[PDB]
Design a protein around this ligand. Structure first.
Ligand SMILES: Nc1ncnc2c1ncn2[C@@H]1O[C@@H]2COP(=O)(O)O[C@H]2[C@H]1O
Ligand SMILES: Nc1ncnc2c1ncn2[C@@H]1O[C@@H]2COP(=O)(O)O[C@H]2[C@H]1O
Ligand SMILES: Nc1ncnc2c1ncn2[C@@H]1O[C@@H]2COP(=O)(O)O[C@H]2[C@H]1O
Ligand SMILES: Nc1ncnc2c1ncn2[C@@H]1O[C@@H]2COP(=O)(O)O[C@H]2[C@H]1O
Lengths: 197, 197, 197, 197
């Protein structure tokens, strides 16, 4: 009904823009596939729907929509449920296509990612590359150091991620200081397999 | 007419989102009841309507819509009417359901609440719990200390509240410094029945 | 056509809100009259229309819409036309009703006003009250001192004003420092007829 | 279809506003011509379309839409493609009419421009005026000095520009410090033909 019509109407607008700007069909297709994998044919207004609810109801809905992501992630599964809820509310859903570069080395990161579904390559230049999958996260090192990306991260497949900005990261750890160490440990651990400590 | 249609059309959108995300009927019902108690079947655009009026007209409307809340509250009833008007303009209407946690201990509060209608439990961990009702307020302690919630507050029933952010709190007291003491007194008084002073 | 329909449709929404909140007809009328005097039956989207034009075109339109206000005001008529244009772009149109209080003493002003059309009383408590009309401005003292309103200002009639915020005030004088003195002179002059210097 | 209808509907609104404010046909025409040259009869919602895509897809689209601008500009053609992409994302499309003043001397610039198509006169008061065309840029001096415009710049013809704000300028050079010198060189070089060094 109203959701499907909101999508096909918006996809329509997108299909016109591509034509006006005469984009390569090499590109229009990526755009088309992105739209499928991101919306599945139904477009809502989360900002509006969720903005119109009380905070307790948002937390109940968000905790449910992410119950599976939470169950796969050691960081959460054993944490205070209020820490978890406080992080889920600050995350933003992002989809990434096979080949896409989620993060670039040398760059100045301002956000991290939690993998809901998909596989990503951590090409840490030189050698000793790595793969992370569902339940893992990355991009935290810059949120702690405030330096530059230690590696690059490329979608091997369609990824569903949840990003968290440095602002929201520090705001959560301000409230739950205990949980910083959980991040530090995995960070310094990851830096050891490279150059950091 | 246009208000009712705006509601049932928006509630429609909400009912779809719930289905797409396959929420427990245990949850869909809470959402449904929330929507009833919050909108009563008519949805307006306060930001637009009120934004389109002069400041004097907003104050006249807001003072009238809150005349009853003002009459129940000792803080206001005896204060400079301009202090009162200046606070009413900064408040935000919030509804909370039976059982909901309005505030959590240990947490870093950034806003307080004034009860228009309803009853809330101040479970101050340990013992000596308390009940506040229509005309009372809470959550001011963190606005003064800038520390953490001294207790938890749970809706015993459907609550209608008006929240005030720390920013707007300090902005009002900047203009009406005399009124800080009224808040301090009730605060230090509340801290005594616990641990504060 | 589209403008008139946008107004009567929005006024419709306003008429419903008043009914829902059961406002005194003493108030609904003020609201109704305000809407007439502010929109004249046609509602546009300045933010959209003007936002869609180049800066030079905005300045040309704004200079024309305010040519009469500019001609009545000694501050402008003899100033660099670029100073003038730079001020006009930052102003915001405001209508005020007979009896309305535009400014209150003791209060912390963050904006000034230029009278396009109407008469206002500067009731400086005590005695020696004053009247300002088309082409005059007021509320500058707090923009300079950063203190409190030295008097109150009440609409004797329907006023059409243009307000300027302290931010935009200081931003203009940052570019045209010479013009501060023009404001200071009238300010210190106004303070002398009271208490300031 | 939907784009053309969005334009002619919005142009309609514009044509009414002009009439309501009784603008000189000397002005209505400039407005009309501006609208043609800026939209070409089709209006989209870039903020919405582009906001709904992943960052990698935006970069792919933006790099393509600006491939020609990039090919004409020595600054880019030889730079790290990621520096280039990082600048393109921050630019804003602006059209300017024959005679328009893009920049005024003595003024406090907060943005620079890259010429996609058109010719502009750098009237540096006094004497020794200059012309810049497709592929050139200007307005960088204030982004570096944080002072005032060294000259004025006037559209000799319809210009298509891309502006970059001081905020985005410093944010890019923060990530790609090497590229500051490329700007400094052309800047100090331009200052020499005048007064700067
Ligand atoms: N050896 C590794 N194993 C897994 N993830 C890594 C490794 N090295 C770096 N990363 C992740 O890659 C990210 C690149 O951006 P950050 O430096 O902010 O954070 C880095 C880590 O989260
Ligand atoms: N003994 C008490 N009686 C009533 N209210 C209380 C009592 N103790 C705490 N509160 C309220 O509970 C709030 C919890 O958050 P705050 O600490 O910011 O502010 C606290 C008070 O407003
Ligand atoms: N004697 C006066 N004559 C005219 N205007 C005045 C006089 N005294 C005060 N005002 C205006 O009234 C304003 C009240 O707010 P401000 O103090 O910011 O600025 C003040 C002046 O602009
Ligand atoms: N001699 C010149 N040749 C080309 N461009 C110039 C010259 N002098 C000034 N400009 C440009 O004109 C701009 C005016 O604003 P800015 O001072 O910020 O930056 C200046 C330069 O980019």
């Amino acid at each position: 009904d109203s959701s499907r019509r909101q999508y096909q109407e918006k996809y329509k607008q997108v299909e016109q823009y591509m034509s006006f700007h005469k984009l390569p069909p090499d590109t229009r297709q990526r755009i088309h596939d992105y739209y499928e994998h991101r919306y599945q044919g139904k477009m809502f207004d989360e900002e509006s729907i969720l903005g119109e609810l009380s905070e307790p109801l948002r937390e109940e809905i968000i905790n449910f929509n992410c119950r599976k992501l939470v169950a796969s992630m050691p960081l959460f599964a054993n944490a205070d449920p209020n820490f978890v809820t406080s992080m889920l509310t600050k995350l933003r859903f992002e989809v990434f296509q096979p080949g896409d570069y989620i993060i670039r080395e040398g760059t100045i990161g301002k956000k991290m990612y939690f993998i809901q579904h998909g596989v990503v390559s951590v090409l840490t230049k030189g050698n000793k590359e790595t793969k992370l999958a569902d339940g893992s996260y990355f991009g935290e090192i810059c949120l702690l150091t405030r330096g530059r990306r230690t590696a690059s991260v490329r979608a091997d497949t369609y990824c569903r991620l949840y990003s968290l900005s440095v602002d929201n990261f520090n705001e959560v750890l301000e409230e739950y200081p205990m949980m910083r160490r959980a991040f530090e440990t995995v960070a310094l651990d990851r830096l050891d397999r490279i150059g950091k400590k």
